[PDB]
Amino acid sequence: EFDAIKIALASPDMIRSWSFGEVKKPETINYRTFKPERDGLFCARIFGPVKDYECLCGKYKRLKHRGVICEKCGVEVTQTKVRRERMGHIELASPTAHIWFLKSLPSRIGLLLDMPLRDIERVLYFESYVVIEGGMTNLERQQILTEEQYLDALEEFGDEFDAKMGAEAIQALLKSMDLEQECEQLREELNETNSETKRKKLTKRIKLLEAFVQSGNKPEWMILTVLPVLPPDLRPLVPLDGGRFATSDLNDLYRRVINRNNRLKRLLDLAAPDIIVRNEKRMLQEAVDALLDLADMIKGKQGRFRQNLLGKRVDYSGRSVITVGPYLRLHQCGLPKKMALELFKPFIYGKLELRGLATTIKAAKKMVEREEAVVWDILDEVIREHPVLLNRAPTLHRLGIQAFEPVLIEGKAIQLHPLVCAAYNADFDGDQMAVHVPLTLEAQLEARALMMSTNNILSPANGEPIIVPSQDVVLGLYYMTRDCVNAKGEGMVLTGPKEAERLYRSGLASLHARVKVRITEYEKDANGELVAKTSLKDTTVGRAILWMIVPKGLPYSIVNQALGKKAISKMLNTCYRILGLKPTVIFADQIMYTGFAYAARSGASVGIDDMVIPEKKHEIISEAEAEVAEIQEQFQSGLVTAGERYNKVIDIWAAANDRVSKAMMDNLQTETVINRDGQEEKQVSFNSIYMMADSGARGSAAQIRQLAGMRGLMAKPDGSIIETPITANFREGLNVLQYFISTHGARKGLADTALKTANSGYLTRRLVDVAQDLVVTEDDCGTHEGIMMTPVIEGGDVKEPLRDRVLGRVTAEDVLKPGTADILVPRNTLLHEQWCDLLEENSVDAVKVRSVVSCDTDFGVCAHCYGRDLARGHIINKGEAIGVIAAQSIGEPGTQLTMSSIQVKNKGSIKLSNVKSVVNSSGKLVITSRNTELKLIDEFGRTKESYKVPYGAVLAKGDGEQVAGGETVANWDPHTMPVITEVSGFVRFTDMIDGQTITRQTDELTGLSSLVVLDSAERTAGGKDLRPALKIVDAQGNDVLIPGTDMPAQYFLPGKAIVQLEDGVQISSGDTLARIPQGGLPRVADLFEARRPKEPAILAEISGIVSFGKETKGKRRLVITPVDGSDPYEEMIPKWRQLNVFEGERVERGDVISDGPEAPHDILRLRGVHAVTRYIVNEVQDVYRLQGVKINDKHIEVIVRQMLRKATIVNAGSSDFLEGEQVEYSRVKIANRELEANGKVGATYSRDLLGITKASLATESFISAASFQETTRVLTEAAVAGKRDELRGLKENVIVGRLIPAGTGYAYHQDRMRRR
Amino acid sequence: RVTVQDAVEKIGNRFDLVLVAARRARQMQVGGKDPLVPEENDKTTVIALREIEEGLINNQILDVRERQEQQE
Amino acid sequence: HARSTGSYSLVTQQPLGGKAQFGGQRFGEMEVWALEAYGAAYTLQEMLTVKSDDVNGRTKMYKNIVDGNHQMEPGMPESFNVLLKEIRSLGINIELED
DNA sequence: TTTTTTTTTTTTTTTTTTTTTTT
DNA sequence: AAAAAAAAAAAAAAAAAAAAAAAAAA
């Protein structure tokens, strides 16, 4: 229909053409007849007829007079739709300044004329004057005046000089501006002027003016002269239930505007004094402001873009409370009969007409109303195989809408497959689900092929199955396969599962008894060929019965365990991986059936005697009371402080709580003490609550703990855990105060849930908004660059192994096992479970892999850059939008969220990363590099540990050696900043002025005093410039030459330093010369917004030797001189931070100066795109891992890509860009690529990380942003720029109502782009 | 049909599957071009998917049939 | 509560909400994201053009359904044109191209 | 004494529906 | 008696951004 859409500013001629008459009357109807008044708001001859094909006077009620306009009333006899389409206009006697451009901040007219907004507002509001063509007067062109100065100008320059006030004055100003001279002088000033604020304003004005001249616009058009008026249909006069009218304020505002304009015209006819007409003009301006700011109709949660374009109510819909049913299969869901007969009513009418049982559709209507038995057969015909969408209320992830084959059922509840419930996050406490009906064959195939519940058994967030059986199926299965020491049928031999079932169901054999049987298992170890193996297996009767439900391919040992929740989950995962999809769907249905049935047969109830109170609870508690009383009296005697007593009491209460926990678990888990057919024997307990806790059905060790043992210690309003924990447990009684404390604990959790959900909704909103455009477009970009992938260790055991990170991605470079020069796999082949396990057994420590952030795709992402499409096995397909699924995966778990020394453990060799060490006096190995790290390489050769060793540590062992498992090697002193020395020699007093720079503080405890260095401020300014310098010298007194350089060994201390040693003492290598004194979802939101943290830890801006600059000039200045580069850069620092770098250090660029939170922007400008994305993904992944939820790194990676979509120019090169310009990265990429392919040279760019909302605003397609988070700014920018809309992404196309270029529609787009 | 994964096995794209199925179903639903495979009192959608499974439908047979139809 | 085809809203030709009025459910923003998260495109177009907004489209789809045809005629969302007229009411000149 | 940089302060955004006052 | 704004409750918390004021020069 229309490939692209265009926008421009309003012009009076275009306004006139759009309208079809002037509405001169501020009136609704004639109020004397029922004929609407001439040229009123509801004017027939302007807009059209009220009744179709009938004139107002009724002269022509016939179609044959279509087009001809009457004369009695002058109403063009047409359809009423003409009223909807035809607009109107008001000819304003006084020009009006449009208001959006007035307070846009920055105002368009504001910086277009280069004057402050306050003066513009004052001039427009008729309380000042402005100069128009000052000429040879004392008044500048942009000078503004007052009444007194107006009188002065009249007295002195009542001649040719002229001025005005208000709308006409501003229109004259705009009309009296050129653009060629403006552009030329502004460019000259930019080239010459070198002031940041003036330069920024000048370049902003240059962009505005060049865009305006490029567009077919004139500045005067931004001042309203003729006011368009909305069609009456969009402003209907709805009468309420009775004799009254209650419509929108639009009619009131229009009546006000027209009344005021008519009054102004009448007064001007009367030639009223300038004051009265001034008031009239100001009132008219206000009326136009009120009528315009329509904005709310376009703005707000209830605006057109958000309430009527994006989220649109739809026919063929319904809703109901949901309910469970086992008998359903995963590929179908129940449906109340009434909703079926109500939704497919058009379909039943059509089917009856085709069937011939009725001819007029009204006959079918009366048939369905009569509920004729024929109608039900037609319903079974239409419902035969015709999926419908079952959607819940908070649609978080793409699984929130799933297709289902309806199965008509009596009642009024939407019966649901139980398993799929887990995906919906839908519990059956009254939640209401909606049913929608696809209509067209495209849509039916679309629902069956994609949204069918069978096609979605693997989640998009990660590879874990989503059909994991939940709570009742799992308990039934677990109770079915659990060995007891002895029962009926114990100790026999069964020929197969069939007679095992026969024995159990007949009651002759217990549901579980360890027994040998014959099982046959089928294995496809050959080239996809089933091989049968059989032999005697020791199993359990219920286990053998269960074996009849597994398909052929799986092994037997998978069902030889207790079959807890996790066991069943990974068992379904193995089925899916080894047997495909259909076997897994059939298997899931069967496992649900055979879980519920045997749960029913189990009768796993819960009585009060199923939770035993351990007898030690009383004794443990009494001992705890004795201990706390003893510590309390110890504090009373004054041996400890209040804080020490509090900590001690809390610690011993925690220890006693753990003791009670262990006692209760020992009592429960092995409670069973029964005979084995001999004397006695223990076994895993059959206590009901323990079974329901161990299987993982509901609860866990934490939850059972407070059902039997003490609840522990709950938190008072602020986490300040009370020193009188809840000694009671739920089975016993709870006294009043303990319940009050529990309320303290729980109300905060509930309020959390509420507001956390509120915030997570908006986080997801931003996340999807900032990743709408990205749609997979290319198979492969043919790029070699990528990111390194390694296991994650924070300073202990590996949190997440390499296999989880690397799985499902595409390698960038070939894997190089430690058999160097062994090509394990091609450099650009996909990776899946088999290859992942091969790499695992090869002990590959790091792998270069391709990430979307590195992809060279244009306006999209290369398919091989995205690797495996989670929720499906094979690689991503051409088109499937990754942006929205990634945003949903990142945002959905937001609801689940919540708002010294080192003892090396394992045995392995010691490696030092960034090693710079020296032997101390004692012989130990200390580290003289701040950024050194310690790796423990296992006997195999991989990195199983990693620890950050701070500056000046202690090591008993050395590099390239071996340390046994558990041998303390890494240790240090985190209290004082060390002043360790690199060399050994005598220590003099060099530049240590006593009485002016330093002071003598005596150690009272011992008497051995030490020199004290004060700060720069407390002492005299004369001693301020005198540095404290500690220089090392040899025995002869000559300076010690540091190896590698000619500089001696001098050390410069900061303020508030305590120099330890005195003159005449030799110092070894590495001696301390001075005692230098010293998170939930909001964290994710801050991280993805990429905001400067509270303490922006500053890194080295450039490599080179370091030195200090001017002192306490607000801040302390650090200058890094590159060895061969240019020094002149300086860095201001608040010197009250405990810095890390000394005065004579040489460090690499991007090295921490002051520790603390790291700002992402500096990390990029100092480390690189790969490094910053690594940091972001690692930190947010850590946040999610804090709660255990798993989200594949790819989604965060693609979001990060979108966050940096913008960049800035460092030089224009041979191109025509402005150096100060700031543009989309791919734009400069393609431009420079085409430039370099030719004989010309490209440009240079620096990337930047605009926050998710910030980068979202950088979206060139204004329609996207016009619908997202604002209307005013986006529409103002689109209007001034005259930016044509490309309609490329997914949000804009939805607005337009055409096929989204994301999924199937992509192919259609691939056709349409082929046309042009 | 429990699922259409076999159709994807035949046409790995998983999207052109939908387009070709819808084209075949639309052609055989409104009129003419009777299904070439026995039905089970199913709608045109199901039989079209079954035909795609059987392999007689592909991305080329529809085009060649249209070409022959055009030639006449 | 369900519906097949009933009265639409006046200011915008969209199905009514709620229960007191014989309305239809809301296909909200989140639902649209979930749909486009899949490759489902035609269904979304039907949801927000032919089943909710396009005044001429839905009538034609009804007539085709009664005739055994499942054919979709795109047309244009009515509320889209309503928004175009409204923003043209401001000092904004927006138009359609080739 | 003027001018550039930085800081501080003011203002405008971010998830149920109109009488009183003046001419 | 007719026409017209919101001065007539309201503030929280946080952030982005624009305008004004205060260093710190040469």
Ligand SMILES: [Mg+2]
């Ligand atoms: Mg609920």
Ligand SMILES: [Zn+2]
């Ligand atoms: Zn007439």
Ligand SMILES: [Zn+2]
């Ligand atoms: Zn790539």
